[PDB]
Amino acid sequence: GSSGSSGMGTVMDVLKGDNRFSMLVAAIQSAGLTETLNREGVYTVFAPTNEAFRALPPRERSRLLGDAKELANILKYHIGDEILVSGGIGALVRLKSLQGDKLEVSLKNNVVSVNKEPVAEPDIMATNGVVHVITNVLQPSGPSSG
């Protein structure tokens, strides 16, 4: 091929390998998405940093680590149904997620954003998918004011 032998790492594995995205994996495993991402195909997932979680409040964070339903929910919205990378965009791109809500991704100033959120290090080639490290845990649409 060109560069092999060393080894690879599936989208999920890529996260499992990276410690920064450890606590996240657990979330996936618990949610029961690992397998899904384990099976070949394509799935755009976003793994935030380590402190990205510590930022989360004990109201949302806990819940996540608590209720799985709500957990997978977030993960679902964090996972896509296609590989979207800053390759041939244009202005805006709508990534059909699993949770149901389409993930918004665009390329401006050469910067990638997901749901109006800054990405850490996008363009993460996997074995059967892609990954885009985020600087903070994404959140699904909802009334957040009260």
Curated annotation (Swiss-Prot):
Changing residue 33 to R: In CDL1; late-onset; found also in sporadic cases. Coiled coil: none annotated. Gamma-carboxylation is controversial. Gamma-carboxyglutamated; gamma-carboxyglutamate residues are formed by vitamin K dependent carboxylation; these residues may be required for binding to calcium. According to a more recent report, does not contain vitamin K-dependent gamma-carboxyglutamate residues. The EMI domain contains 2 expected intradomain disulfide bridges (Cys-49-Cys85 and Cys-84-Cys-97) and one unusual interdomain disulfide bridge to the second FAS1 domain (Cys-74-Cys-339). This arrangement violates the predicted disulfide bridge pattern of an EMI domain. It comes from Homo sapiens (Human). Changing residue 44 to R: In CDL1; delayed age of onset. It is found in: Secreted; Secreted, Extracellular space, Extracellular matrix. It is linked to Corneal dystrophy, epithelial basement membrane: A bilateral anterior corneal dystrophy characterized by grayish epithelial fingerprint lines, geographic map-like lines, and dots (or microcysts) on slit-lamp examination. Pathologic studies show abnormal, redundant basement membrane and intraepithelial lacunae filled with cellular debris. Corneal dystrophy, Groenouw type 1: A rare form of stromal corneal dystrophy characterized by multiple small deposits in the superficial central corneal stroma, and progressive visual impairment. Changing residue 78 to R: In CDL1; late-onset. This is Transforming growth factor-beta-induced protein ig-h3. Induction: By TGF-beta. Plays a role in cell adhesion. May play a role in cell-collagen interactions. It comes from the Eukaryota. Residues 8-138 form the FAS1 domain. Highly expressed in the corneal epithelium. Expressed in heart, placenta, lung, liver, skeletal muscle, kidney and pancreas. Binds to type I, II, and IV collagens.
